[PDB]
Structures are given as C-alpha cells and as structure tokens.
Design a protein around this ligand. Structure first.
Ligand SMILES: CC(C)CCC[C@@H](C)[C@H]1CC[C@H]2[C@@H]3[C@H](O)C=C4C[C@@H](O)CC[C@]4(C)[C@H]3CC[C@]12C
Ligand SMILES: *[C@@H]1O[C@H](CO)[C@@H](O[C@@H]2O[C@H](CO)[C@@H](O)[C@H](O)[C@H]2NC(C)=O)[C@H](O)[C@H]1NC(C)=O
Ligand SMILES: [Ca+2]
Ligand code: NA
Ligand code: NA
Ligand SMILES: [Zn+2]
Ligand SMILES: [Zn+2]
Length: 784
C-alpha cells in the first residue's frame, strides 16, 4: 500500500486500495506517499555542470547520474550539458526514409502531443518564439490549419480526435450536458464525467488494446506538472519490451488558459507559447537521448482556437423573453435552451424560437431548432442536444440575465479564429511537406494506420489523408453500384398522359444518346449505393437520374460555360409542365397535387433560364425535371438558378453543376428510407425534401475551362434547408442580392456530406487517383 517503485504505473489498481497512476489525484485516491515519491521537484528540470556524474539522490526531480539513461529519468539536457551533444533543435532536418528504432522496438511508437486552444495563426510567430515547433513544422508534414468539430470546446474535440466520430455520435456533445435518460448532468469539473455511461464510440486507446497494442495512460491530473508528464513518457519508453506501450499522449492546458485571460493576440501570449515550445524541446531532447528521435511518430495537434470575447459583449435572454425563470440555458459562446421543470404546457419551444428571431437590428445570435442547423455541423442526432440552439456571433456571449476573461471559443467551426493546428513528424510522415487543411474527424484513421490498427467504424474518410504519409497501409477502393440505371427510350404517346396541366414530332434525335454525356457528365455518372429503380434521362442541356420511387430526380447534371447567356421564362411558358414520354404515368408527378396543396408549389432542377436555345428550353418544363418547392424557398432557388450559377461560371471559367433533393426527416445525416419520409404533397405519394443540394465543380487551373480540365478539380457545395419561410434570414425583405448568397455560405457542405444524405457516389470517372478524389470530397469551401 504505497508508491515505492509504482509511480505512474501503467496498470490501474481496483478499489479500495490506493493508486499511483496518472489519474489517482483526479479520483482523490492516491497513496499517502504519492506526492512524496512521484511528484519530485527538487533542483528543477535541468542538469547543470556541477551535477554531471553525481551519485543518485532519489529526492531530485530528474537526474544527472550514469544510471539515468537506462531508467529514462535523466533531465532532458543531460547529454548537452554533460556529454557535449547539441540540442535537437540545432540539428538540421534529415529525411527519415525508414524508421531507425533501437533494439526491442517492433513498430515506431506514436506520441500524441495535444495543446489546448492552440490557434492556427500562432504558427506565424515563427522560430523566434517557437524554434522547436517550427523545426517540426518545417522538417515534417503540416497543414495551414486543421478544422475542429462544433462545438469548438475542449471535451467534444478531444474525444472526436480519439474516436473519429462527430460529437452527436460519440455522445460528448459539450463540456456541460444533461441526459434525460440518465437524469444526470455531465460537467468539466466534478466526478460524474468519470462514469463510463457518457462515452460512446471506441477511442484509440481501446482500439489499440483490443488489437494487442499497449497504450500509455492518455490523461493527466492537472496537479502533475508538464515536465513530469514528459519524463513519465520517457521512463515508460525505457521499459522492457512486454511492459512498453506503443502509443502515448501528452495534454497541455496552455495556450488555452492564457488565451482565456488575455485573449488570442495579447502580448501576454508570447510567454505561454515559449513554455509550450520549451516543453516540445524537452520531449525531442529526451527522445534524442534514448535514440528514439528518428523512430517515434509525433503528432502536434490542437483541439480548437480562441477568439476575443469580453463581458461587455454579452447578449441576455431576459432582453428577449419575459419568462427566463421557466427555462434552463447552457450559456456562453453557444446557447442550448431547455424547460426548467418537466410537465409544462406553458413551455412551447416554437414560441421561444419566434421570440428570439430577428428582434433587434444588431442581434448577435441566431436561434434554431436543432434539425434546422447547417448540416455541416452534424449537431442534431443525440438526446443530449437540446431542441433549441443558439448560434452566437464570433466575439460574443449569451447569458440568461444580468473583466477577468478576454478570450473564449466554442463558436461555429468554420470561423477562422476557431481553426487549430496539425503537424506530423517521424519516419511514416512525409518530409518537408505541406498538405491542404482538413477536419479533425480524419485523424483517428491516420493514427490507426500509424499503429497498424484496423479503425473502428468512424466519420473520417479512410484514404483521404494518404497524401500525408510516406507509405500507406490502407488502399481505398471505390464502392460498387447497388442499382444499375435503366435507359428508357420513347415508349408512350403524349395523348395517353393526363397529369392535369396545360403546356418533337419532326425531331427523331430528340433526347437521344449523343454528346450529352461528354458535355454535361464530366466526371462520370453518379453511382447509386442503395437498392432502388431509376432511369437515366438525356437532354440537350442536362442529364438526370430520375427515381421511379420518389417520382423525381435523385441528381441532375449540367455544365454552364463562362460565355453562357441567361434568358427569361416566356409569359406563355410560365405555368407550363410537359409529360415525359420516356417515363410512365404511374411513375410521374401530377400538377393536380400542387393545386390541392396551398402551401406547396414547384420548381425545376435544371433552370429554364440557362437553356441553350428556344427549342431546348422546352426540356426544362418536363414533369421529370420538376420538384416540390415552398414559395419562400423558390425566392432562394430562382435567384441561385437565374443569377448565381452564371456568376460562378463567369468567375470560375465555366462550372459543372449537380443538383438534387435530400430527405433527412430523422436528422441523422443519412439518406431516409421511404418509411422515414414524414411529409408528402397533398393527397399524393410525392415526398417533400428536407433539403436541396448542389455541387459546383470546375478546374483548379482556372485558365482551363471546366469541360477541358486536365489537372485537379475545385469544388464548392451546399445543402439548403427546404423551409416554408425565410425566418433564418433577417434581411429577406430586401433584394435577393442582399441575403441569398449569405444563406448559401452558411449552408456550405462537403461532397461527402451530400453522399451520406443521398446514397450517391460522385467523381467516379476522372483522370485523378481515388485518393485525391477522397480529399476533394472532404473539402469544405469556408468563405473566410
Ligand atoms: C484531469 C481530467 C480532465 C482527466 C479526466 C479523464 C477522463 C475524461 C477519462 C479517464 C478514464 C476515461 C475512460 C477510460 O479510458 C475507458 C473508457 C472505455 C471506452 O470504451 C470509452 C471511453 C472511456 C469510458 C474513457 C472516457 C474518458 C475517461 C473517463
Ligand atoms: C458516423 O459514424 C457512425 C459510426 O460509423 C455512424 O453511426 C452508425 O450508424 C449506423 C447506421 O445508422 C448504425 O448501424 C450504428 O449503430 C451507428 N454506430 C455508431 C457507433 O454510432 C454515423 O451514422 C456516422 N455519421 C454520419 C453523419 O455519417
Ligand atoms: Ca435520415
Ligand atoms: Na400551390
Ligand atoms: Na426573414
Ligand atoms: Zn480546449
Ligand atoms: Zn478553453
């Protein structure tokens, strides 16, 4: 019952007996002599010349004795001070072609060095402020920035890093949360967070253990100083082969702690950043002492950034609501609202939202029902996410009712100040290599590959980060189609239709297989990865995949050149809908349903505004090009089609557009089955989409047009909520030029998001490698 020879022991002793592990303080369960034996601090963390070849005094924090290297408990500068070696940072970058591990090591170990609140722009402070970090970044592989998950808080992002899962899937939806099934609350401070019931998914340390790879204890009690954490990892690395872990993690509270007090760009932040870099230097010096500097893979990673936030920029819910005592708020850089007491007829969340919507001219938050939040946030499918959510403007706070802190974080994850860091260094990482920015959900697959592990099912796209690594244990393969398209010719007469709406004989080559494929399907046909029956429909200006089940297109593909002219809908074609002779009356929509539904109207996927001729314009009014649209939504859609597509074509030297409907009534981010569709157009089997997407593709080399592109592609995409009002847009009374683009930028998306929501697979026939295509699919156009 003591810590004699057990300090930071990898085994965890069960109750009641006392412990000597990393987290014994966090449970208040350490042995009587834990601080005496394990938290040694005498004579600091640095050897001095007078200590060289000293006899071991066991009261010292670290050692300068000739027995220390074998134990791994030397001070990190021992060989520099006592053996005339250089610091790691003073050595030049040398390419690590293969791992160079000492005897015993069957694989390169992984060191995860996670720094709290390390904003991406701090990297610009350079080798002046952070020599060690700048060497890792220069010599190794790095991105401009890494995107965190929403909310951009500590716990959701640390656990996302460990699982590859979105917060809604792993369950840690915030630093604070209530679970109605448990009827308990989780808090950053306190003992409740230690209970396993909160934590879903499978984090890296469990994935490792289950596949026979030993993991160090990832988490450190705040009492343990940063130098003690580094020495502990160095001692663990000196263990026998059967006791030694292959994966470790260091966590730092800085620069987050100091960012909170002083804000992100204070002159006070230089000191935190120097301390962090000094600590990195101690690790890299320590690894060099053990001849592990060209063996271990190191990941320098942050959980989120930091924004300027002060007490004077606080919105109060009592300035909007008359009954803030009947509701519970998770306050701060985000809002989550809940009823105070259960069983309250007075509490209607739809009236609360209405009361919080566009009420002051300069209002610095926006309310949402969680299912109406942008889909890119993936913040809805969990019982711990409150129905009512407030997205708060950058630099602001929200509190319930009416300084020491100048910084905070937790805002929308595409906000520039919330972006964080990634650096990879070691044998498996590439040498002096810059990679495009990526999302922290992708890192778990990378870390599994660095340890030879099969990842558990997660939300990363395995293969999308292969370009970070020298050698790739995982080769992504493209999934096969589950459903082959039908290609119906002309079958029925126009006389034999009766769809209830007023509006070829000379043209034999009408709607035939010609150059439609080459003009309008630039990257091959989208593959349907679920079981359904659908038809391919060719036209002069566009191709489409028409679902016979949902009675509309799943996708519509067209290519607008830079020089394309916009035209108007003629007065005679304004209420025009033609039947499609290639599709049966049974599998077609009818106009009668849209007359019966007073709320609902219709729009077109391929725009009649962009048609190539007066002849070809008639193809846009086919019933197979038609989809259900609320009048409110048609303001947005008509503006996109008539104005914005041309604008993008003009800006990007032509664009290829792929547009279509999404059904996600259970808000899980996944394609709905027909059972889960909860709304249809009045008295018919035509389903109502929850969202509409478009994918806008062009050549990254803008000097080449979109239809003659040799090299990489550039993409931007959106998933627009299909809502009966424009209450989300506070300026929707003004001209569409003052608010529709802002709405679309808020609802930007990855092509991967649209694939989960549609069951489609895009970009199947290109000249690019599949790996490069997976990176293109995971890209988000942020507009920052
Ligand atoms: C100083 C404090 C902030 C550190 C507290 C760390 C705390 C969040 C950690 C400690 C133990 C962790 C659990 C443990 O590793 C095992 C599992 C099994 C795995 O399948 C799910 C995760 C879970 C429950 C860990 C969650 C995080 C815990 C509680
Ligand atoms: C994120 O990944 C998880 C795990 O792959 C997905 O959740 C799974 O969803 C399937 C299908 O609904 C279920 O069979 C499993 O029970 C879920 N597993 C876990 C561990 O959650 C989730 O759908 C993914 N999210 C997105 C948006 O694609
Ligand atoms: Ca769904
Ligand atoms: Na109508
Ligand atoms: Na409005
Ligand atoms: Zn944090
Ligand atoms: Zn913080």
């Amino acid at each position: 019952g003591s810590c004699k020879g057990r300090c930071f022991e990898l085994q965890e002793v069960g109750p009641p007996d006392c412990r000597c592990d990393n987290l014994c303080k966090s449970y208040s369960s350490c042995c009587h002599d834990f601080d005496e034996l394990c938290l040694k601090t005498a004579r600091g963390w640095e050897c001095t010349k007078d200590r060289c070849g000293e006899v071991r005094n066991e009261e010292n924090a670290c050692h300068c004795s000739e027995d220390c290297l074998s134990r791994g408990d030397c001070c990190t500068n021992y060989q520099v001070v006592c053996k005339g070696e250089s610091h790691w940072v003073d050595d030049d970058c040398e390419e690590i072609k293969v791992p160079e591990c000492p005897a015993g090591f069957v694989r390169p170990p992984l060191i995860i060095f996670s720094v709290d609140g390390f904003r991406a722009s701090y990297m610009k402070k350079g080798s002046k402020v952070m020599p060690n970090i700048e060497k890792l970044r220069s010599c190794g592989t790095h991105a401009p920035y890494m995107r965190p998950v929403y909310p951009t808080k500590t716990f959701p992002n640390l656990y996302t890093l460990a699982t590859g899962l979105y917060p809604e899937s792993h369950g840690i939806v915030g630093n604070s949360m209530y679970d109605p099934v448990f009827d308990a609350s989780f808090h950053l401070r306190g003992r409740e967070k230690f209970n396993h019931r909160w934590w879903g998914g499978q984090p890296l340390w469990i994935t490792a253990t289950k596949q026979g790879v030993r993991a160090g204890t990832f988490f450190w009690s705040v009492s343990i100083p940063h130098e003690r954490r580094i020495l502990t990892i160095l001692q663990w690395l000196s263990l026998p082969d059967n006791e030694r872990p292959s994966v470790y993690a260091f966590y730092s509270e800085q620069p987050d702690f100091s960012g909170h007090k002083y804000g992100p760009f204070g002159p006070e932040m230089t000191n935190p950043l120097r301390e962090i870099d000094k600590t990195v230097g101690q690790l890299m010096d320590g690894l060099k002492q053990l001849r592990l500097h060209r063996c271990v893979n190191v990941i320098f990673v942050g959980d989120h950034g930091m924004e300027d936030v002060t007490c004077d920029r606080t919105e109060f819910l009592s300035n909007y609501l008359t009954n803030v005592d009947d509701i519970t708020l998770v306050p701060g850089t985000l809002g989550r609202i809940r009823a105070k007491s259960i069983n309250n007829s007075k509490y209607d969340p739809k009236t609360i939202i209405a009361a919080l919507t566009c009420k002051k001219p300069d209002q610095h938050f926006k309310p949402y029902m969680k299912q109406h939040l942008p889909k890119r946030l993936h913040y809805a499918n969990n019982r711990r996410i409150e129905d009512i959510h407030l997205l708060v403007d950058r630099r602001w706070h929200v509190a319930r009712k009416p300084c020491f802190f100048q910084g905070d974080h937790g805002f929308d994850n595409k906000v520039n100040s919330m972006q964080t860091v990634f650096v990879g260094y070691g044998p498996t990482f590439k040498y002096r290599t810059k990679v495009p920015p990526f999302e922290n959900i992708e890192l778990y697959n990378v870390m599994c590959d660095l340890l030879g592990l099969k990842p558990a099912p997660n939300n990363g796209t395995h293969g999308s980060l292969n370009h970070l690594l020298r050698t790739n244990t995982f080769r992504p393969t493209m999934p096969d189609e589950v459903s082959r398209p039908n290609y119906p010719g002309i079958m029925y007469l126009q006389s034999e239709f009766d769809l209830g709406c007023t509006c070829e004989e000379f043209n034999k080559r009408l709607h035939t297989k010609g150059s439609t494929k080459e003009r309008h399907l630039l990257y091959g046909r989208p593959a349907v990865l679920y079981r359904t029956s659908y038809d391919i429909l060719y036209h002069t200006d566009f191709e489409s995949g028409y679902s016979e089940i949902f009675l509309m297109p799943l996708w519509t593909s067209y290519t607008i050149s830079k020089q394309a002219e916009v035209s108007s809908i003629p007065e005679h074609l304004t209420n025009c809908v033609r039947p499609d002779v290639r599709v049966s009356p049974g599998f077609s929509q009818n106009c009668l349903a849209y007359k019966n539904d007073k709320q609902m109207s219709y729009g077109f996927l391929f725009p009649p505004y962009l048609s190539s001729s007066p002849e070809a314009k008639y193809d846009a009014f086919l019933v197979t090009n038609m989809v259900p649209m609320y009048p409110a939504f048609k303001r947005v859609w008509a503006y996109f089609q008539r104005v914005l597509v041309k604008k993008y074509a003009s800006e990007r030297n032509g664009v290829n557009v792929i547009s279509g409907p999404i059904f996600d009534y259970n808000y899980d981010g996944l394609r709905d089955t027909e059972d889960e569709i909860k709304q249809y157009v009045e008295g018919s089997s035509i389903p109502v989409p929850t969202h509409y997407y478009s994918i806008i593709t062009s050549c990254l080399d803008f000097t080449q047009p979109a239809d003659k592109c040799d090299g990489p592609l550039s993409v931007s995409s959106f998933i627009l909520p299909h809502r009966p009002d424009n209450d989300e847009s506070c300026a929707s009374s003004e001209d569409e030029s003052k608010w529709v683009e802002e709405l679309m930028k808020m609802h930007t998306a990855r092509v991967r998001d649209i694939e989960h929501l549609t069951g489609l697979d895009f970009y199947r026939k290109t000249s690019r490698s599949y790996s490069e295509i997976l990176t293109l699919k995971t890209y988000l156009h942020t507009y920052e």
